[PDB]
Write a protein that binds this ligand. Structure first.
Ligand SMILES: Cc1c(Nc2ccccc2C(=O)O)cccc1[N+](=O)[O-]
Length: 266
C-alpha cells in the first residue's frame, strides 16, 4: 500500500470523476506520458506510476524471483489502486503495460471500465498459425547482445523502436533505456517473451481500444487484428496516421486525439 505509492513514484494529477491510469512500457518511465498528459488533466483524474523495472525506481526493489511473471506486476497495479481507494477507472497501457492491463481487467472486472492498449501484443513469438513477429533464434541473439554490450544494444534499438525519424524522441527513449539496469532490462524482456496471453483474451469484459500505428517493430498489423478478434469486450482498432512503437513520444498530439475520444465515456 502506502510504501508502494512511494516506491513506484505514484502521482495523481488533474481532477474528475473519470479516473485514468497511465501505465508505461519497456524502457521508459511515467515521464513518457508528459506530452499527452496536458490533454487529459482538465477532464480526468490521472494516476501515473513507474513499473518496478523502470530506471527511475531504485533497482534494489526489483525482486527477480517475484517478477518472473506478469501477475506480480498486476499485483502492484492493483495494490496502488486499492491504496488510492479508486473503485473504477480507465486504463491506458503501453507495451508490457497493455499485457498487465489485460490481466488486471480479468482479475478485477469491477475496477477496469475501459482499456486503451498502445503497442500491444498478446504474444511476441511466432507459433503455428500465429504470427507474433519474432523467432526464438532471433531473440536469443538479442538477449545475448543485451548482456554482452547493453549500451551498444540500446543505442541500436532506440531508433528502431521509435521508427519514425524523430531525433528528440530517439534521444528521450534512449535516456530512459540507458537508465534501466541491464540485468533488469534483460529479465523483463525474458519474462515478456515467455508470456502468452492468447488464451485469456476472451476473459476480458471491458471495452477496449487497440491503438495501432502504421508500422510497429514489436507489433505486426495482424496482431492488432488478432486482439480485435479475440478480446472479450467491445473492441475497436484505432489506426494512428504515423509509424512507431512509442507514439506517446513521437506523435503525442495525434495520440492525444485518440485518447480523448476513447476516454470520453466509460
Ligand atoms: C521487441 C524487443 C523488446 N521488446 C519488449 C520487451 C519487453 C517488454 C515489451 C517490449 C516491447 O517491445 O514493447 C525488447 C528487447 C528487444 C526486442 N527485440 O525487438 O528483439
Amino acid at each position: 500500500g502506502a510504501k508502494l505509492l512511494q516506491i513506484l513514484n505514484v502521482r495523481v494529477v488533474g481532477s474528475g470523476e473519470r479516473v485514468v491510469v497511465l501505465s508505461h512500457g519497456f524502457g521508459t518511465d511515467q515521464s513518457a506520458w508528459s506530452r499527452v498528459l496536458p490533454y487529459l488533466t482538465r477532464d480526468h483524474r490521472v494516476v501515473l506510476y513507474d513499473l518496478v523495472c523502470a530506471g527511475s525506481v531504485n533497482p534494489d526493489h526489483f525482486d527477480f524471483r517475484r517478477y518472473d511473471n506478469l501477475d506480480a506486476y498486476v499485483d502492484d497495479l492493483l495494490a496502488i489502486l486499492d491504496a488510492l481507494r479508486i473503485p473504477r477507472c480507465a486504463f491506458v497501457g503501453h507495451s508490457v503495460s497493455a499485457m498487465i492491463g489485460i490481466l488486471a481487467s480479468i482479475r478485477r472486472p469491477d475496477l477496469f471500465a475501459k482499456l486503451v492498449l498502445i503497442g500491444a501484443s498478446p504474444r511476441f513469438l511466432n507459433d503455428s498459425d500465429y504470427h507474433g513477429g519474432f523467432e526464438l533464434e532471433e531473440i536469443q541473439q538479442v538477449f545475448d547482445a543485451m548482456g554482452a554490450n547493453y549500451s551498444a544494444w540500446a543505442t541500436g534499438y532506440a531508433p528502431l523502436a521509435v521508427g519514425a525519424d524523430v531525433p528528440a524522441a530517439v534521444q528521450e527513449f534512449s535516456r530512459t533505456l540507458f537508465n534501466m539496469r541491464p540485468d533488469i532490462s534483460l529479465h523483463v524482456c525474458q519474462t515478456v517473451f515467455k508470456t502468452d496471453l492468447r488464451g485469456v483474451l476472451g476473459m476480458v469484459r471491458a471495452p477496449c481500444v487497440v491503438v495501432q500505428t502504421t508500422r510497429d517493430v514489436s507489433v505486426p498489423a495482424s496482431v492488432a487484428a488478432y486482439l480485435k478478434a479475440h478480446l472479450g469486450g467491445r473492441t475497436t482498432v484505432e489506426f494512428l496516421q504515423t509509424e512507431g512503437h512509442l507514439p506517446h513520444l513521437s506523435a503525442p498530439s495525434l495520440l492525444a486525439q485518440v485518447l480523448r475520444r476513447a476516454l470520453a465515456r466509460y
